[PDB]
C-alpha cells in the first residue's frame, strides 16, 4: 500500500476530507492508498516533529500532506527540513506549508501548492499585456524576492515583439532611520501610467502613505502588485489605492478538501509508476535517532516521480523548487469599497479574465 | 570589392582571417520564433550575434 | 548633463543665421536662437543641421545653447592646436 | 529578572569558557547561560531546541561548529526552530549564503561573513592589480548563485561586467568538456567559486589542460586552499583566507556581549514579554523577538576580540578584512591585507603560476577571426 | 515669435479637505515656467504641494 499522512490544523470539515479518500479512483493504478489522518491543533512546532516521527515509525509512510489554517511561515520552513531528514515527501497544499520559500533544500522533497515569485511576476505581464498597458515602473525594496521579480521581468521585454518599455527600476531601502525624504525623493521620479510594486504587507503602507503625499494615486495611475503584499484580502490598511489589482491563488474556488484530493492523487498516482517499473517501496529507518548512519539508503526514486503527475487532464506537475508550473492564479481588483473581488484567472499560459475594455 | 578591403584591414592592422559564407544566405533581421514571443536574428546578423 | 553646449557656424544650405526680428526682439518661430561673440549678441540659427539637432534633441531629450564659432571655422591643426568648431 | 543566553555549542570543551564571558557580561537584570552540546542528530535539535527554551526561556541562541565538517545542515534547526518564536540565532561558524536571506531565515545573526561576501573582496582586489576581463568558474547551487550573483551587480558601478560566467554542477568528475570552452576566451583571469571538493575536479582538469601555466591568474575562496583542494591546486593562486574564521574561543567572547549590551537596550522598551515558557504550550508569535532582533542590527559594538562587531541590513557581518593566500612551493603564504575598504600588499612577493614574477596582464586578445561574407555580385 | 501655453491650470483653495484633488491635476505640469498668480500666504501651501 501507500502510507498517506493528511494533517489538518484548526477549523476545517475533516468528514468531507475522508470523503475524496475512498472517492479517489485508483483501481486501474492500483496505488492502494492507505490514508491514516491525525488532527490536532498548531500548539507547537515539536508536536509536528512528535507526530511525523511517531507515525514515520508507526506504518511507514511514503508520503505526507499537509493543510494549515495558519498563515505563519515559519510552518513551512520547519516540514522542508524535516523531509531532509526523514526523506520522506511533504506537501504542503494549504496554509502556512503552503506559501512558497525563495530556495529549497536540495536533500528535501518538500513541495507547495502555490506559485513562485517570478511565476507571478509573469502574469503581471499577461494581464497588462491585453489592455495595451506597456509603460512600467518597477518599485522594489530590499525583500529577498525584489532581484528575482525584477529579474524576470526585465528579461522577458529584451526580445519581445510588442512595444515594451521599462522607464525607472528605482529600488528603496527603508531600513535607515528617518528614511521619509530619502523614499520620498525617489518615488517623486515616477511618471508611468502603471507602477509595479514588490514589498511586504506594512511596506505597502509605508510606500503607499508618501506615494499619496506624491499623489500617486489617481485614476490614470494603476499599480499591479504581487499576492505577498496583499496577503489576507481581508484586512486593508486604508492606504491601498482605489484600484489596486493583485494575484493569488484560486483559494476561494479551492477547498480544503479539495486540495486534499490533489494531495493524495498527487502522491498516489507517482508511487504506483515507481513500484511497476523501479519496484521498490521506500521504507527508510524507523527512528529518527542517530539518522547520518541511516543515510545508506535513498529516497530519490519516488522524487522524480512526482516532478511529473497529470490527474484528471490536469497537469499537477511541480519543480525542483516545489512550485506547481501551471497552478491556480486569480487576479483581484479593489471595488468601491475595500473589498478584493476576483476579475479572472491565468492557467497554463490561457490567462482569461471576466472584465473586458477595463474602466 | 569587400574582400579586397578586408585584405587592407588584416594587413594594416595585423590581424588573420577566416572567411566563411552565411549558412542561411540570408542578410540579416529580426523574426518571429516557434511561438514563444521571442524575437531571434538570422542571417550575418545572428552569425555575428 | 542634459543642457550642453553646442557650437555652430553658417554654411549655406545646412547653417542659416539671421539678425533677431525688430519688433519682438527675440528669435522666430522655427528659428533657435543662437548667440555671437564679437560681450555677445543673439542671432536666430536655421537650416537643414539645425532642423536634425531639434529632431535629436527631441528623441534623445536633452537641450542646448547653440552658439556661432569666432576662434575661426570647421577645424584646422595649426602649430598642433585646433581652432573653430573642432 | 533573569534573562537566558543559552547556545547550542558543540565542542563542550569551550562550553568552560563560555560560562566566563557571561560571568563578565553581567557587569560589563541578570543573564543566565544555559548552553547544551551540539550532538551529532538533527532532528532532536529541533525537539532540544524547545527542550532548552522550555527550562530556560532563551532570548537570544548561539550555535557553533560541531564535529561533523558538512557545516550545511547542522545549525539550520536551530535558526528553523527559534524563527517559530522569531528568537535570533547567532552564526558562530556558519559561511554560507542560505542564511543570508531573511525569507528563511527571518531572525538570524551572524559573526563571520559568508563565502559569498568574499566577491566583493575580489572586486577590490582585481581593481588594484587592473584586471578588467574575468572568468567565472561559479558552481550551481546556492551558495554558487549567490557568489556570483554579487560579482555580477557589483561590476555595474563600472558599468561593466563578466566576459562569461560558467556554471558547472556540484560533485561533478569530467568538467573539462565545459572548461575548454573558456580556453578559446580573450580572458585570462579565472575565478572560482567552487567547494572543497569541486575546487580539486577543475584543479586537476586544469593541470592537464595547461591553464594553471604562464599567463593565468587564478583567484578563489577559503575553500579552493583548503582540505583536499589544495593538494592538487597548482601553484601562484592568490586566494582568500579570514583570519580567524574557525577560532570558535575567539567568537564566542565577543558574540555573548553584543546580546549583553543589547540586555541594556532591552531594559528601556514597551510592551517587552518573556520567551515562552514552554514549547509545546506556546504558538505565538512573540513581537519582541522582531524588536530584539531589529535593535540589534542596529548596535554596533566599540570593540571586540576579533574587531568592531557591526551587522548588516540581512544581519551578516560588516567591514570585516580577510588574509590573502599565496601558494608558494606547496604552501601558503600571507601577501596581502585586506582593511575592509581596500587591500594592502605584503612585502612578499607574488610569485604568479608558472613562476611570472612580473604581474600577467591577464587577457591575450585572439588576432585570428572568424569573418562572414554572403554572396553579393559586384562587392 | 514661438510662443506656446500648454495649460492655464485653475486651483481651487476654497474646498475643505481637497488638498488631495489639487494634488492630483497639478502633476500635469511640466513646463520648465509655470506663472503662479495667487496670495503670498496660498503660494506657501501651493509651493510645498509642487515640493
Same mark, same amino acid.
Given at each position: 500500500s501507500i502510507g498517506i499522512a493528511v494533517i489538518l490544523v484548526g477549523t476545517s470539515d475533516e468528514v468531507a476530507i475522508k470523503d475524496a479518500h475512498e472517492k479517489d479512483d485508483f483501481h486501474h493504478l492500483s496505488v492502494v492508498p492507505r490514508v491514516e489522518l491525525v488532527a490536532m491543533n498548531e500548539t507547537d512546532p515539536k508536536s509536528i516533529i512528535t507526530r511525523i516521527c511517531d507515525l514515520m515509525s508507526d506504518r511507514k509512510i511514503?508520503?505526507?500532506?499537509?493543510?494549515?489554517?495558519?498563515?505563519?511561515?515559519?510552518?513551512?520552513?520547519?516540514?522542508?527540513?524535516?523531509?531532509?531528514?526523514?526523506?520522506?515527501?511533504?506537501?504542503?497544499?494549504?496554509?502556512?506549508?503552503?506559501?512558497?520559500?525563495?530556495?529549497?533544500?536540495?536533500?528535501?522533497?518538500?513541495?507547495?501548492?502555490?506559485?513562485?515569485?517570478?511565476?507571478?511576476?509573469?502574469?503581471?505581464?499577461?494581464?497588462?499585456?491585453?489592455?495595451?498597458?506597456?509603460?512600467?515602473?518597477?518599485?522594489?525594496?530590499?525583500?529577498?524576492?525584489?532581484?528575482?521579480?525584477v529579474n524576470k521581468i526585465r528579461s522577458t521585454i529584451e526580445n519581445?515583439?510588442?512595444?515594451?518599455?521599462?522607464?525607472?527600476?528605482?529600488?528603496?531601502?527603508?531600513?535607515?532611520? $528617518?528614511? $521619509?525624504?530619502?523614499?520620498?525623493?525617489?518615488?517623486?521620479?515616477?511618471?508611468?501610467?502603471?507602477?509595479?510594486?514588490?514589498c511586504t504587507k506594512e511596506e505597502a503602507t509605508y510606500i503607499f502613505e508618501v506615494a499619496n503625499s506624491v499623489g500617486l494615486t489617481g485614476y490614470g495611475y494603476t499599480w499591479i502588485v504581487?499576492?505577498?503584499?496583499?496577503?489576507?484580502?481581508?484586512?486593508?490598511?486604508?492606504?491601498?489605492?482605489?484600484?489596486?489589482?493583485?494575484?493569488?491563488?484560486?483559494?476561494?474556488?479551492?477547498?480544503?478538501?479539495?486540495?486534499?484530493?490533489?494531495?493524495?492523487?498527487?502522491?498516489?498516482?507517482?508511487?504506483?509508476?515507481?513500484?511497476?517499473?523501479?519496484?521498490?517501496?521506500?521504507?527508510?529507518?524507523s527512528s529518527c535517532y542517530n539518522t547520518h548512519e541511516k543515510r545508506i539508503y535513498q529516497s530519490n526514486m519516488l522524487n522524480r516521480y512526482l516532478i511529473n503527475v497529470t490527474f484528471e487532464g490536469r497537469n499537477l506537475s511541480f519543480s525542483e523548487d516545489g512550485y506547481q508550473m501551471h497552478p491556480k492564479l486569480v487576479i483581484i481588483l479593489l471595488n468601491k469599497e475595500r473589498k478584493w473581488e476576483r476579475v479572472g484567472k491565468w492557467k497554463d499560459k490561457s490567462l482569461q479574465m471576466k472584465y473586458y475594455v477595463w474602466p | 570589392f569587400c574582400i579586397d578591403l578586408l585584405i587592407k584591414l588584416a594587413r594594416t592592422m595585423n590581424f588573420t582571417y577566416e572567411v566563411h559564407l552565411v549558412a542561411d544566405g540570408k542578410f540579416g533581421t529580426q523574426e518571429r520564433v516557434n511561438n514563444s514571443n521571442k524575437k531571434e536574428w538570422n542571417g550575418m546578423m545572428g552569425e555575428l550575434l | 548633463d542634459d543642457h550642453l553646449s553646442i557650437v555652430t557656424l553658417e554654411e549655406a544650405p545646412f547653417v542659416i543665421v539671421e539678425s533677431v526680428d525688430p519688433l519682438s526682439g527675440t528669435c522666430?518661430?522655427?528659428?533657435?536662437?543662437?548667440?555671437?561673440?564679437? !560681450?555677445?549678441?543673439?542671432?536666430?540659427?536655421? !537650416?537643414?543641421?539645425?532642423?536634425?539637432?531639434?529632431?535629436?534633441?527631441?528623441?534623445?531629450?536633452?537641450?542646448?545653447?547653440?552658439?556661432?564659432?569666432?576662434?575661426?571655422?570647421? !577645424?584646422?591643426?595649426?602649430?598642433?592646436?585646433?581652432? !573653430?568648431?573642432? | 529578572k533573569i534573562v537566558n543566553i543559552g547556545a547550542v555549542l558543540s565542542t563542550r570543551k569551550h562550553e568552560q569558557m563560555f560560562r566566563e564571558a557571561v560571568n563578565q557580561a553581567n557587569k560589563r537584570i541578570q543573564l543566565? &547561560?544555559?548552553?547544551?552540546?551540539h550532538k551529532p542528530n538533527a532532528i532532536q535539535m529541533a525537539l532540544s531546541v524547545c527542550e532548552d527554551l522550555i527550562s530556560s526561556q532563551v532570548y537570544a541562541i548561539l550555535v557553533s561548529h560541531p564535529p561533523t565538517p558538512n557545516d550545511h545542515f547542522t545549525p539550520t534547526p536551530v535558526s528553523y526552530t527559534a524563527g517559530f518564536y522569531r528568537i535570533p540565532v547567532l552564526g558562530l561558524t556558519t559561511r554560507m549564503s542560505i542564511y543570508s536571506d531573511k525569507s528563511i531565515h527571518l531572525s538570524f545573526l551572524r559573526t563571520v561573513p559568508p563565502y559569498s561576501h568574499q566577491s566583493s573582496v575580489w572586486f577590490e582586489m582585481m581593481r588594484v592589480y587592473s584586471w578588467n576581463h574575468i572568468i567565472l568558474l561559479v558552481s550551481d547551487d546556492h551558495e554558487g548563485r549567490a557568489a556570483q550573483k554579487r560579482l555580477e551587480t557589483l561590476l555595474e558601478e563600472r558599468e561593466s561586467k563578466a566576459e562569461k560566467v560558467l556554471q558547472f554542477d556540484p560533485g561533478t568528475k569530467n568538467v573539462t568538456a565545459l572548461l575548454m570552452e573558456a580556453k578559446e576566451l580573450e580572458a585570462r583571469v579565472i575565478i572560482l567559486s567552487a567547494s572543497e571538493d569541486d575546487a580539486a575536479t577543475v584543479y586537476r582538469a586544469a593541470a592537464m589542460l595547461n591553464m594553471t601555466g604562464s599567463g593565468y591568474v587564478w583567484l578563489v575562496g577559503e575553500r579552493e586552499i583548503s582540505?583536499?583542494? /589544495?593538494?592538487?591546486?597548482?601553484?601562484?593562486? /592568490?586566494?582568500?583566507?579570514?583570519?580567524?574564521?574557525?577560532?570558535?574561543?575567539?567568537?564566542?567572547?565577543?558574540?555573548?556581549?553584543?546580546? &549583553?549590551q543589547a540586555v541594556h537596550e532591552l531594559l528601556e522598551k514597551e510592551n517587552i514579554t518573556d520567551p515562552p515558557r514552554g514549547c509545546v504550550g506556546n504558538t505565538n508569535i512573540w513581537k519582541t523577538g522582531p524588536l530584539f532582533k531589529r535593535v540589534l542590527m542596529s548596535s554596533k559594538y566599540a570593540d571586540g576580540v576579533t574587531g568592531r562587531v557591526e551587522f548588516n541590513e540581512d544581519g551578516?557581518?560588516?567591514?570585516?578584512?580577510?588574509?590573502?593566500?599565496?601558494?608558494?612551493?606547496?604552501? /601558503?603564504?600571507?601577501?596581502?591585507?585586506?582593511?575592509?575598504?581596500?587591500?594592502?600588499?605584503?612585502?612578499?612577493?607574488?610569485?604568479?603560476?608558472?613562476g611570472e614574477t612580473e604581474k600577467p596582464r591577464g587577457y591575450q586578445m585572439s588576432t585570428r577571426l572568424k569573418i562572414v561574407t554572403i554572396h553579393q555580385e559586384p562587392f
Amino acid at each position: 500500500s501507500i502510507g498517506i499522512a493528511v494533517i489538518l490544523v484548526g477549523t476545517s470539515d475533516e468528514v468531507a476530507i475522508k470523503d475524496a479518500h475512498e472517492k479517489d479512483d485508483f483501481h486501474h493504478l492500483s496505488v492502494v492508498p492507505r490514508v491514516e489522518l491525525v488532527a490536532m491543533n498548531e500548539t507547537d512546532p515539536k508536536s509536528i516533529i512528535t507526530r511525523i516521527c511517531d507515525l514515520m515509525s508507526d506504518r511507514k509512510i511514503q508520503g505526507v500532506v499537509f493543510a494549515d489554517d495558519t498563515d505563519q511561515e515559519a510552518i513551512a520552513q520547519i516540514l522542508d527540513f524535516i523531509s531532509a531528514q526523514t526523506l520522506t515527501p511533504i506537501l504542503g497544499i494549504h496554509g502556512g506549508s503552503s506559501m512558497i520559500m525563495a530556495d529549497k533544500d536540495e536533500s528535501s522533497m518538500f513541495f507547495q501548492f502555490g506559485p513562485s515569485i517570478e511565476q507571478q511576476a509573469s502574469v503581471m505581464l499577461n494581464i497588462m499585456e491585453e489592455y495595451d498597458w506597456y509603460i512600467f515602473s518597477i518599485v522594489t525594496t530590499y525583500f529577498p524576492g525584489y532581484q528575482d521579480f525584477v529579474n524576470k521581468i526585465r528579461s522577458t521585454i529584451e526580445n519581445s515583439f510588442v512595444g515594451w518599455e521599462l522607464e525607472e527600476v528605482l529600488l528603496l531601502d527603508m531600513s535607515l532611520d $528617518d528614511g $521619509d525624504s530619502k523614499i520620498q525623493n525617489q518615488l517623486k521620479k515616477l511618471q508611468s501610467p502603471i507602477i509595479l510594486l514588490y514589498c511586504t504587507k506594512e511596506e505597502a503602507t509605508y510606500i503607499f502613505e508618501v506615494a499619496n503625499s506624491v499623489g500617486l494615486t489617481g485614476y490614470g495611475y494603476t499599480w499591479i502588485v504581487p499576492s505577498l503584499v496583499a496577503g489576507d484580502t481581508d484586512t486593508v490598511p486604508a492606504e491601498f489605492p482605489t484600484g489596486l489589482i493583485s494575484v493569488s491563488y484560486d483559494e476561494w474556488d479551492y477547498g480544503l478538501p479539495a486540495r486534499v484530493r490533489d494531495g493524495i492523487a498527487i502522491i498516489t498516482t507517482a508511487a504506483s509508476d515507481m513500484l511497476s517499473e523501479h519496484s521498490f517501496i521506500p521504507e527508510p529507518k524507523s527512528s529518527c535517532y542517530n539518522t547520518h548512519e541511516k543515510r545508506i539508503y535513498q529516497s530519490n526514486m519516488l522524487n522524480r516521480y512526482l516532478i511529473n503527475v497529470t490527474f484528471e487532464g490536469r497537469n499537477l506537475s511541480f519543480s525542483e523548487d516545489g512550485y506547481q508550473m501551471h497552478p491556480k492564479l486569480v487576479i483581484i481588483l479593489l471595488n468601491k469599497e475595500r473589498k478584493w473581488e476576483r476579475v479572472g484567472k491565468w492557467k497554463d499560459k490561457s490567462l482569461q479574465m471576466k472584465y473586458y475594455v477595463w474602466p | 570589392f569587400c574582400i579586397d578591403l578586408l585584405i587592407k584591414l588584416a594587413r594594416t592592422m595585423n590581424f588573420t582571417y577566416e572567411v566563411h559564407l552565411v549558412a542561411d544566405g540570408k542578410f540579416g533581421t529580426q523574426e518571429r520564433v516557434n511561438n514563444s514571443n521571442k524575437k531571434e536574428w538570422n542571417g550575418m546578423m545572428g552569425e555575428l550575434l | 548633463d542634459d543642457h550642453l553646449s553646442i557650437v555652430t557656424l553658417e554654411e549655406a544650405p545646412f547653417v542659416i543665421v539671421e539678425s533677431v526680428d525688430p519688433l519682438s526682439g527675440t528669435c522666430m518661430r522655427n528659428t533657435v536662437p543662437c548667440q555671437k561673440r564679437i !560681450g555677445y549678441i543673439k542671432k536666430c540659427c536655421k !537650416g537643414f543641421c539645425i532642423d536634425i539637432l531639434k529632431k535629436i534633441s527631441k528623441s534623445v531629450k536633452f537641450t542646448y545653447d547653440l552658439y556661432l564659432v569666432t576662434n575661426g571655422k570647421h !577645424g584646422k591643426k595649426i602649430n598642433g592646436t585646433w581652432n !573653430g568648431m573642432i | 529578572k533573569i534573562v537566558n543566553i543559552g547556545a547550542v555549542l558543540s565542542t563542550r570543551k569551550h562550553e568552560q569558557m563560555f560560562r566566563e564571558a557571561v560571568n563578565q557580561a553581567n557587569k560589563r537584570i541578570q543573564l543566565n &547561560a544555559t548552553s547544551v552540546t551540539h550532538k551529532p542528530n538533527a532532528i532532536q535539535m529541533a525537539l532540544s531546541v524547545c527542550e532548552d527554551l522550555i527550562s530556560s526561556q532563551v532570548y537570544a541562541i548561539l550555535v557553533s561548529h560541531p564535529p561533523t565538517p558538512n557545516d550545511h545542515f547542522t545549525p539550520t534547526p536551530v535558526s528553523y526552530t527559534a524563527g517559530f518564536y522569531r528568537i535570533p540565532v547567532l552564526g558562530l561558524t556558519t559561511r554560507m549564503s542560505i542564511y543570508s536571506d531573511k525569507s528563511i531565515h527571518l531572525s538570524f545573526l551572524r559573526t563571520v561573513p559568508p563565502y559569498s561576501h568574499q566577491s566583493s573582496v575580489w572586486f577590490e582586489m582585481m581593481r588594484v592589480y587592473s584586471w578588467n576581463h574575468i572568468i567565472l568558474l561559479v558552481s550551481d547551487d546556492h551558495e554558487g548563485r549567490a557568489a556570483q550573483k554579487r560579482l555580477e551587480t557589483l561590476l555595474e558601478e563600472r558599468e561593466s561586467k563578466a566576459e562569461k560566467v560558467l556554471q558547472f554542477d556540484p560533485g561533478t568528475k569530467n568538467v573539462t568538456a565545459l572548461l575548454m570552452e573558456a580556453k578559446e576566451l580573450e580572458a585570462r583571469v579565472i575565478i572560482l567559486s567552487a567547494s572543497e571538493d569541486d575546487a580539486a575536479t577543475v584543479y586537476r582538469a586544469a593541470a592537464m589542460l595547461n591553464m594553471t601555466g604562464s599567463g593565468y591568474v587564478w583567484l578563489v575562496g577559503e575553500r579552493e586552499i583548503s582540505g583536499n583542494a /589544495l593538494r592538487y591546486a597548482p601553484d601562484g593562486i /592568490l586566494g582568500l583566507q579570514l583570519i580567524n574564521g574557525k577560532n570558535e574561543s575567539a567568537h564566542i567572547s565577543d558574540a555573548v556581549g553584543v546580546v &549583553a549590551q543589547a540586555v541594556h537596550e532591552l531594559l528601556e522598551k514597551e510592551n517587552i514579554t518573556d520567551p515562552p515558557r514552554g514549547c509545546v504550550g506556546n504558538t505565538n508569535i512573540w513581537k519582541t523577538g522582531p524588536l530584539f532582533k531589529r535593535v540589534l542590527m542596529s548596535s554596533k559594538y566599540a570593540d571586540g576580540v576579533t574587531g568592531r562587531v557591526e551587522f548588516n541590513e540581512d544581519g551578516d557581518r560588516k567591514f570585516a578584512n580577510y588574509s590573502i593566500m599565496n601558494l608558494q612551493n606547496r604552501k /601558503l603564504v600571507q601577501v596581502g591585507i585586506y582593511n575592509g575598504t581596500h587591500v594592502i600588499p605584503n612585502d612578499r612577493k607574488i610569485i604568479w603560476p608558472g613562476g611570472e614574477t612580473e604581474k600577467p596582464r591577464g587577457y591575450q586578445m585572439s588576432t585570428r577571426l572568424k569573418i562572414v561574407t554572403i554572396h553579393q555580385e559586384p562587392f
